[PDB]
From Swiss-Prot:
Zn(2+) binds at H92, H94, H117. Substrate binds at T196, T197. Changing Q90P: In OPTB3; in Czechoslovakia. This is Carbonic anhydrase 2. GO terms for molecular function: arylesterase activity; carbonate dehydratase activity; cyanamide hydratase activity; zinc ion binding. Its cofactor is Zn(2+); Co(2+). Catalyzes the reversible hydration of carbon dioxide. Can also hydrate cyanamide to urea. Stimulates the chloride-bicarbonate exchange activity of SLC26A6. Essential for bone resorption and osteoclast differentiation. Involved in the regulation of fluid secretion into the anterior chamber of the eye. Contributes to intracellular pH regulation in the duodenal upper villous epithelium during proton-coupled peptide absorption. It holds the Pfam family Carb_anhydrase. Gene3D superfamilies: Alpha carbonic anhydrase (3.10.200.10). It comes from Homo sapiens. It is an enzyme of class 4 (lyase). Target of drugs used in treatments against glaucoma disorder and breast cancer. Optimum pH is 6-8. Changing H62W: Impaired activity, rescued by 4-methylimidazole (4-MI). Impaired activity, not rescued by 4-methylimidazole (4-MI).
Length: 258
């Protein structure tokens, strides 16, 4: 029936319902640090999240999304490789069943335990739905998570997971500050790509941060307790919801640092 991450409906089958899966600018990709072009003209990233307004958290059967009020420039991203302002609409994670896998992008083939995606849309286009019709409609900030010490700013999220265990459940999730999930440095790699889940639209300017954040093993364990299934159905743990690296093709990865 529909898409997932299993043997019968996983990433390798996606092309049947979404032909763009085999397109020219698909994500994720492996970041070869020795081939990435240092670009001195890349301006510093500008993350203005002081007015961020979170609204809800929801398990959609594939992963969980924390949604934000994007009716005004409350939480925006600009600078870096971007032209114009991009509004934060939601953030989600991709993780593995084990600590050695989970991230979508890899750095010199290295896989992290998880990857956080903060999705933004170009205000120039009015709304998210119109933004996904443009080659520069979206900007996703990717942050790697590695297992180590606990991330205080992630605990609020971890605590609420019990209430949205199954597919379709949602919970109010207000007053959450996304600044607590940012690493110290804002150095990054950037390249043009796509969303990593169907519809796999090629509308994304990826900004992948060099420095990962650390979360405890207990924090990641909570992620693995979520369910792909809806309430009452046989239990399928939500793990390994990541897409493998796609061919880079006619693309260049640029770094904002040396
Ligand atoms: Hg697009
Ligand atoms: Zn994602």
């Amino acid at each position: 029936h529909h898409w997932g991450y299993g043997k019968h409906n996983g990433p390798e089958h996606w092309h049947k319902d979404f032909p763009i899966a085999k397109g020219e600018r698909q994500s994720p990709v492996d970041i070869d640090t020795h081939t990435a072009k240092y670009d001195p003209s890349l301006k510093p990233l500008s993350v203005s999240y002081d007015q961020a307004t979170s609204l809800r958290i929801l398990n959609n059967g594939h992963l969980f999304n924390v949604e934000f009020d994007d009716s005004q420039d409350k939480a925006v991203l600009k600078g870096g490789p971007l032209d114009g302002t991009y509004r934060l609409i939601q953030f989600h994670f991709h993780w593995g069943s084990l600590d050695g896998q989970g991230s979508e992008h890899t750095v010199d083939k290295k896989k992290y335990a998880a990857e956080l995606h903060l999705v933004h849309w170009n205000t120039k286009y009015g709304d998210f739905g119109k933004a996904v019709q443009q080659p520069d409609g979206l900007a996703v900030l990717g942050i790697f998570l590695k297992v180590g010490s606990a991330k205080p700013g992630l605990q609020k999220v971890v605590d609420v997971l019990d209430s949205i265990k199954t597919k379709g459940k949602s919970a109010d999730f207000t007053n959450f500050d996304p600044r607590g999930l940012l690493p110290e440095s804002l150095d990054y790699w950037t390249y043009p790509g796509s969303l990593t889940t169907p519809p796999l639209l090629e509308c994304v300017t990826w900004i992948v941060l060099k420095e990962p954040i650390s979360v405890s093993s207990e924090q990641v364990l909570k992620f693995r307790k979520l369910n792909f299934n809806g309430e009452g159905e046989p239990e399928e743990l939500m793990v390994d919801n990541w897409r493998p690296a796609q061919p880079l093709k006619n693309r260049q990865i640029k770094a904002s640092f040396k």
